[PDB]
Design a protein around this ligand. Structure first.
Ligand SMILES: [Cl-]
Ligand code: NA
Ligand code: NA
Length: 158
């Protein structure tokens, strides 16, 4: 009923490779809120702006007991370099095979260049403590986004 998106059961058990060399799974986050933001490419202007915006708000996400994960299909090493350069204090998922991206349906197609071109569409999701996707943002406008996600989280968590 409150879900806005249904994920395959297996999604919650996918091993997600993180910056720093460990793995997580969505099921491992049971009991707390989780913000999952998808972005197209490490170390590009919009993606850097977005990551820095979330990073600045971490204490506010902490107040709600929430954790954040950023996701792109860049490698672990790329993610390590991006985190270190920018000072991010939350993890980045290296979704190299786009398994997590496909589960959230963020790989979108555009007819361009006389081709059918597939890519990550900037998108964010709020996952409840019981693993329901209760809010989505797609074709994300970076400016103001992290603030809006925090506000929505607070509204849902209260
Ligand atoms: Cl959705
Ligand atoms: Na960088
Ligand atoms: Na969760």
């Amino acid at each position: 009923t409150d879900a806005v998106l249904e994920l395959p059961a297996a999604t919650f058990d996918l091993p997600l490779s993180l910056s720093g060399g460990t793995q997580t799974t969505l099921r491992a986050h049971a009991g707390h809120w989780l913000v999952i933001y998808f972005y197209p490419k490490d170390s590009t202007p919009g993606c850097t702006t977005e990551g820095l915006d979330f990073n600045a708000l971490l204490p506010e996400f902490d107040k709600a007991g929430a954790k954040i994960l950023g996701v792109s299909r860049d490698s672990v090493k790329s993610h390590d370099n991006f985190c270190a350069k920018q000072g991010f204090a939350f993890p980045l998922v290296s979704d190299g095979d786009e398994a997590l991206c496909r589960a959230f349906d963020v790989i979108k197609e555009k007819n361009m260049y006389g081709k059918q071109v597939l890519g990550i569409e900037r998108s964010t999701f709020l996952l409840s403590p019981e693993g329901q996707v209760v809010q989505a943002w797609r074709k994300v406008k970076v400016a103001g986004h992290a603030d809006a996600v925090l506000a929505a989280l607070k509204a849902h968590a209260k």
